[PDB]
Amino acid sequence: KKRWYVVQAFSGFEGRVATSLREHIKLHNMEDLFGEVMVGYVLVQMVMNDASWHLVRSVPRVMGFIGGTSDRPAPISDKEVDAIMNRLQQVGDKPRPKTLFEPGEMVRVNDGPFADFNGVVEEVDYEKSRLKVSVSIFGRATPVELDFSQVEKA
């Protein structure tokens, strides 16, 4: 059974640290003692012998493990590892705004000169895909038409 550990590298050379780590594994052929390498911190599926510990710290541009102590360093305490599987890829995924297209519902504007302003949708047009919301500009409400993505639901 191989448990996870956290490695610190010089932040910026991290892919080169990962490649050099895979290559040191396939040099010193402790192939049964390493599972993966995930990407300033590098995640390593590993077991703990002092030989493999010296191996990972003899990989260049690696400072050391991060744990409770340096004698017996600590398996990454990611209790939500199942949630980290769903977090993988979702971290690098953006969303989209959806204006509250309903009479009297407040919305938010984040596009055009009306960006950074809130207002209410007095009228909605699903067929024309347009929301009728006015913005409190200099006091007077400024009824303007904004798309669902142009404004966010408040």
Binding site: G112, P113, F114, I137, F138, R140, T142, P143, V144, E145, L146
Partner: protein, 98 residues
């Protein structure tokens, strides 16, 4: 296609309002079809003035109404930008239908 409707009562105060919004749009966007007006709107009401008698004293008052439409031609990201939270006419209802 972009409409700037302006809604008030008198033509003697909206007349400086149609001057401030075509020229400040000219310095930034310079894209406007010109002010196209609307028929003047009248709300006349005859009301009794004697306190308890005499259905003859009916004095005519009116809350007058006027509407003027600017209609910039192109959705400019400079006309709206500079004239967003900006309107010289005070006590007025601006309707920037974008």
């Amino acid at each position: 296609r972009i409409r700037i409707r302006l809604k008030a009562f008198d033509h003697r105060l909206i007349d400086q309002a149609t001057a401030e919004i075509v020229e400040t749009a000219k310095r930034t966007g310079a894209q406007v079809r010109g002010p196209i007006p609307l028929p003047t709107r009248k709300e006349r009401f005859t009301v009794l003035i004697s306190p308890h008698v005499n259905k003859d004293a009916r004095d005519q008052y009116e809350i007058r109404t006027h509407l003027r439409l600017v209609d910039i031609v192109e959705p400019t990201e400079k006309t709206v930008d500079a004239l967003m939270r900006l309107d010289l006419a005070a006590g007025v209802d601006v309707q920037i239908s974008l």
